[PDB]
Design a protein around this ligand. Sequence first.
Ligand SMILES: CO[C@@H]1O[C@@H](C)[C@@H](O)[C@@H](O)[C@@H]1O
Ligand SMILES: CO[C@@H]1O[C@@H](C)[C@@H](O)[C@@H](O)[C@@H]1O
Ligand SMILES: CO[C@@H]1O[C@@H](C)[C@@H](O)[C@@H](O)[C@@H]1O
Ligand SMILES: CO[C@@H]1O[C@@H](C)[C@@H](O)[C@@H](O)[C@@H]1O
Ligand SMILES: CO[C@@H]1O[C@@H](C)[C@@H](O)[C@@H](O)[C@@H]1O
Lengths: 89, 89
Amino acid sequence: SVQTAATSWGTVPSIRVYTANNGKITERCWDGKGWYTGAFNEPGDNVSVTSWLVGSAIHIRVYASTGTTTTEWCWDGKGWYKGAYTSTN
Amino acid sequence: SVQTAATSWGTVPSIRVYTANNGKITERCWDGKGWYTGAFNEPGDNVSVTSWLVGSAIHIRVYASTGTTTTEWCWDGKGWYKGAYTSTN
Ligand SMILES: CO[C@@H]1O[C@@H](C)[C@@H](O)[C@@H](O)[C@@H]1O
Ligand SMILES: CO[C@@H]1O[C@@H](C)[C@@H](O)[C@@H](O)[C@@H]1O
Ligand SMILES: CO[C@@H]1O[C@@H](C)[C@@H](O)[C@@H](O)[C@@H]1O
Ligand SMILES: CO[C@@H]1O[C@@H](C)[C@@H](O)[C@@H](O)[C@@H]1O
Ligand SMILES: CO[C@@H]1O[C@@H](C)[C@@H](O)[C@@H](O)[C@@H]1O
């Protein structure tokens, strides 16, 4: 079966839902109207997510894994880009 | 594939990333500098987390499962400890 993770913020719930389907991740978004498709689209067999606010600004971090390789895609208000997360230190 | 869970708190932020790989879970932490390895080391090929703040003090609960057995692990400001959680009534 597919794998999903979810996060959310505000009183006016915005909710993001990430679905790992067949090695591909699709983001679903809701801002109080209808659900819609977001800009997130990255490879991976499993997902986790978190989010925080700095005032009314959301930051999201998505943790996408395939095999033993975990990648982080960062959302800070502008665009998705590759984060500096690594597994070993 | 590996399975990750993640949580965070604050506006810095702090981020905890737990990974289930080969029946073992290992914690990865970030508090504004680089990523680093956490104190958490528990068996489980599936993980979930949640964290809550009391003022500025973080509390974290990790849900570590193998087979049908779920063990809770707590961080409350000192050391990790085995939670009182049970999955049945
Ligand atoms: C108002 O609509 C209900 O709550 C929203 C926050 C969403 O979770 C939506 O799918 C649900 O049907
Ligand atoms: C404004 O853009 C929408 O919301 C952001 C918080 C992200 O979830 C992004 O992928 C989405 O398309
Ligand atoms: C500032 O660096 C970016 O944001 C941090 C909160 C982390 O998620 C890090 O891995 C990422 O590269
Ligand atoms: C202070 O210790 C660090 O942060 C705590 C909140 C825990 O995540 C712990 O495992 C980690 O080593
Ligand atoms: C006080 O009890 C501890 O903290 C609670 C919030 C629960 O996580 C419980 O299972 C745990 O043993």
